[PDB]
Amino acid sequence: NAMLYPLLTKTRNTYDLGGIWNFKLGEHNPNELLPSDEVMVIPTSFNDLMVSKEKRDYIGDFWYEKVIEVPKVSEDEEMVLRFGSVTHQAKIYVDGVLVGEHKGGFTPFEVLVPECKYNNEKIKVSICANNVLDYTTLPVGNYSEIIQEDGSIKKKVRENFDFFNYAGVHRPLKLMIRPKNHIFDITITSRLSDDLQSADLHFLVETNQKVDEVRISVFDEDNKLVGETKDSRLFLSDVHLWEVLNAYLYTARVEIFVDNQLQDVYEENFGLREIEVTNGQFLLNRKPIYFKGFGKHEDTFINGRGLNEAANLMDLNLLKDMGANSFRTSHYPYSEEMMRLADRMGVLVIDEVPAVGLFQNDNGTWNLMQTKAAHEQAIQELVKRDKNHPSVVMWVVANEPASHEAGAHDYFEPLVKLYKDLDPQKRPVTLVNILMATPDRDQVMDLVDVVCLNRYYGWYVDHGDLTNAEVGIRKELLEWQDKFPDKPIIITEYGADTLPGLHSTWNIPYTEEFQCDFYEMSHRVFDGIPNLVGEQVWNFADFETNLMILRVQGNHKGLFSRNRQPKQVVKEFKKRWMTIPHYHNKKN
Amino acid sequence: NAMLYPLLTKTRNTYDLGGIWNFKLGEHNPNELLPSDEVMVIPTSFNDLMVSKEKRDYIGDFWYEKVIEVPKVSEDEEMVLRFGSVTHQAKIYVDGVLVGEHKGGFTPFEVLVPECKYNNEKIKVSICANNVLDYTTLPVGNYSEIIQEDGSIKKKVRENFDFFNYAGVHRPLKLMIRPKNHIFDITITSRLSDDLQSADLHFLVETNQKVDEVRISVFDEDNKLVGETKDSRLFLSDVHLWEVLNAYLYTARVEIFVDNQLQDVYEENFGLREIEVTNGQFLLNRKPIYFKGFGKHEDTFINGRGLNEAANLMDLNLLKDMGANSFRTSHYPYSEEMMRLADRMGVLVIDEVPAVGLFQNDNGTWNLMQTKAAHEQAIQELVKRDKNHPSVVMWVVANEPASHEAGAHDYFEPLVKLYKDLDPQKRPVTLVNILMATPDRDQVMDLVDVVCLNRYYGWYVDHGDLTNAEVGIRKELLEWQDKFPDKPIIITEYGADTLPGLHSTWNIPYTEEFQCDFYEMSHRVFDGIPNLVGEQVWNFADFETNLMILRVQGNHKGLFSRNRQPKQVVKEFKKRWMTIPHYHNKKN
Numbered sequence A, B: 001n002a003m004l005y006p007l008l009t010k011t012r013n014t015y016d017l018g019g020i021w022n023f024k025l026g027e028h029n030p031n032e033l034l035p036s037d038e039v040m041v042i043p044t045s046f047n048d049l050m051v052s053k054e055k056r057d058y059i060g061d062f063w064y065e066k067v068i069e070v071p072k073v074s075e076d077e078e079m080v081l082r083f084g085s086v087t088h089q090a091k092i093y094v095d096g097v098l099v100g101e102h103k104g105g106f107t108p109f110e111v112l113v114p115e116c117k118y119n120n121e122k123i124k125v126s127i128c129a130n131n132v133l134d135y136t137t138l139p140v141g142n143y144s145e146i147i148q149e150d151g152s153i154k155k156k157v158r159e160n161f162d163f164f165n166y167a168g169v170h171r172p173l174k175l176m177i178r179p180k181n182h183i184f185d186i187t188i189t190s191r192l193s194d195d196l197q198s199a200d201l202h203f204l205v206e207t208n209q210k211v212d213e214v215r216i217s218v219f220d221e222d223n224k225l226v227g228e229t230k231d232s233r234l235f236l237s238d239v240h241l242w243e244v245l246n247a248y249l250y251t252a253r254v255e256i257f258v259d260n261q262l263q264d265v266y267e268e269n270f271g272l273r274e275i276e277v278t279n280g281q282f283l284l285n286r287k288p289i290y291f292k293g294f295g296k297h298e299d300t301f302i303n304g305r306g307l308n309e310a311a312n313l314m315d316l317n318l319l320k321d322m323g324a325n326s327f328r329t330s331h332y333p334y335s336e337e338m339m340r341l342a343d344r345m346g347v348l349v350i351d352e353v354p355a356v357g358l359f360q361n362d363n364g365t366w367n368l369m370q371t372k373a374a375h376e377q378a379i380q381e382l383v384k385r386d387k388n389h390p391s392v393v394m395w396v397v398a399n400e401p402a403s404h405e406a407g408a409h410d411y412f413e414p415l416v417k418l419y420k421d422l423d424p425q426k427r428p429v430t431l432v433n434i435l436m437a438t439p440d441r442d443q444v445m446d447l448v449d450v451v452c453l454n455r456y457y458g459w460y461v462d463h464g465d466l467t468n469a470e471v472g473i474r475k476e477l478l479e480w481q482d483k484f485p486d487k488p489i490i491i492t493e494y495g496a497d498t499l500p501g502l503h504s505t506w507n508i509p510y511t512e513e514f515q516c517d518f519y520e521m522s523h524r525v526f527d528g529i530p531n532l533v534g535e536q537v538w539n540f541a542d543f544e545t546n547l548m549i550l551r552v553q554g555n556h557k558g559l560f561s562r563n564r565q566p567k568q569v570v571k572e573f574k575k576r577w578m579t580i581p582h583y584h585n586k587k588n
């Protein structure tokens, strides 16, 4: 139900509830008042703000609590709490009463404040967050309980993924006063003309109640009126297209009317562009694109997975300065803020649900992977939240699932359909593939539009041995190309752990020089694979992980450090990506 | 006029305007519409988000611009834009019309939106920021213009201080709808009883217009009503005192009434505690305190000087885990958010105005230091903003001014009076003293209540030579103690540049081991100076500076890295500061 970015309009009062909240790890009676012994900030991951390991590794319930003043709410209005997200599960209390609930740590939801409380001076909001991951959650966790002889129970999650399980309220929480009868959803659809110069627009507006009139006023980047309709249909002559690294955004002001008066007004941006996949190519505006960019993480010192709009912008500025043009939201939906920024900057985005960890670890006879419900929900929420973004060019169903094992096809078949059935634009959906699932073994890739591969020849296979890595990477890309002559291929991950300061004359893995050598070898291969249409390094920047022997205080495959300072290899990518055009047809 | 923290109340709608703004370095006609070519985030320093040096070093006008929806404003209300701060100077435009202005980069101000625009759908807000520092500004800059033969003029500021000149909108901007007749200011005063168990409270409420009734309801930490008055006076029996690292906050709900109805309601927190200085001691609640803590900076990767509430909390958590109890807002007022947090956590705060750089670089015959106006304004704004914070225990008039040169006394004499005249609590005021201004030479310290010294024997004097540094530090503290047997002494800065990873067996400056040795030597001296009542390391964390040969990519005197990871010496401070009690009377 929370699919619309919270805006301030003359009919919608939006209040930011961020700041300091009373805070507690562990159990709490929401009928009672949390002390100010512990506090926590909203938004931010809580983990790094803890000074001890035991606290940073806490798993279970933890609470945020604040007494909040009730604004003026008129008879025809209602009041909702709107969360960008709570990680991973959340129960929301008003005055000690359970009033809403959510599962999924990376998508927004709203919670209605009971009408009977609108004439009160104050309300106490209590948020019971929970950071347990399961075989029933996304991402997938290995959950276990050990009794302490205390004998309290210690909960722990052995992540089935390579990123630290940051938890907390990572995204802005809003107190939202809006009309009872309001605009629930807006879907924007366009059919571009033969020559790509005009657009037949369809604005599909959802309401809960009867409306007399629905006026839509479209404005261009100069805020000049260029179209108006009362029937949901608009024809725009001589449009400006949304082009890679050269964005053009229209904004659709939607006003609804009952009995000759404004009931609700919302402003939704859209961009005009066409996506197609054919002949081993990714077409944007009917021209062949070459992806260059990064797998990313929402990760930063101090804030962990919490939203930092300034990091979004610093990254995006660097991306574009490098000559890059895209990135993937690995391994979970990013914040709305980041999406709106990619739109504004013309950056291509591969948008993914948190389906990472779908891989067991004899044996497995019993049904342990109960992920289907969460998966279906994740897909619905992402498409409903993100479908209007011109920057979203493709969906990902999973990252590195066990796609070579029996039962894989039948799990993904309906989920891929779901993206198609839900996306008005029917964008391509992909599946990101692990090295184990080789062309012969894999049994899922027939279902998808674009082949995405994470490959580390010269790092995990043939470690530090480029001569043989080259033969391996080339061999496999040729098998993929052959098995699917039709589909485009995108390297969604490739890189090499690199610690700033480590140096060698002898191409030594972990040194800055080896990072350069690794990418040279990789690009020499890619450039000779006709159906390979894009390359996205892992990772943009170094990032936090859990304790595992092959992680040297986090992942270090970043071109930048966690503090966003460049490694040696950045100069090299800048020379390469400024030489390859965005609209680059190889083939030729 | 912006002395009250912006709150949401039933009479005050407060909207956050943060997020993405159109942005441009350089000249702009506010009657015209800024493109979305450049964007910038609010709040954040702009500098680090620039990928090129030329852009990061830009000096002059730069603009933020956004079209903003106008909320419902009733006939008895008014609409103001409220800035936490703009660095360093700001001119504010509505629809191309100049509508307000501010000088000083670290204090809040409000700007009235013209009433005639309240029935409009939208308003364009334009912010022309400026980051020039002068001989007329605080902090003090060395300003110069060189013609490029372009021939545009390149503006540059040679900072007269040791921190990078981060600029931008560092703090939240709010759109604020409030009653025409509202509560302008609340000053909270208390006289504690002989035995410190009761408090006679005086709530001084300022209004612009007539009010019929002023009701004040005080609530304790459990939100239970403990007092109520209609005459500005309240006697509270058996209070809970605000104690170091053990805070207790009351909150004063102030409601005003005209003709039997609520005109405005505001909630202001206060804490009860007594401060006194006598016999070379700093008394809190009539017990002798020992300061332990940090000089700090509002500094962080990516965001620069922009507000990051999560960094405030992570720092404060670390501070208290270390057994520390205070910090100084060097070298400028911190955000309101940080102040409210110090109150909530019981941390002592030395609150300072941006009077750093008051030092020339023959000669100087002509009046070049035109800082007096800015200085007077800074002092008024800080006291008006911060006077109610129980955590604020002392004011600083300047950091490291030329207090040994003729004319120093006469400059500071009236400014010290100003703090006294403005502070209802008449807290101590101090002056932070440079090594050049030695007991004999100095001519300002008679004016102040507490002696604050920045001393670096073993780092700037006797570099890396502890044996002789010890004799020097001891010698000087004995001269200070002798010249002012009355006043307490606080070391406000001492430390040693330390790069993480640098190691040695031989007590080598810049190594982690030397940092430890330096502090051992320093504490061995301090412990034998009876009138030395506090020690604050420079710095909490490493921080950004300009280009100067003795700065190795910033300042590295931090106990923590810029990323908040500990250096070797942290273990040592934790052992020492957990052994020294907060209420520690040496003498004895």
Ligand SMILES: [Mg+2]
Residues within 6 Å of the ligand: A364, A365, A366, A367, A368
């Ligand atoms: Mg099974």
Ligand SMILES: [Mg+2]
Residues within 6 Å of the ligand: B364, B365, B366, B367, B368
């Ligand atoms: Mg002079």
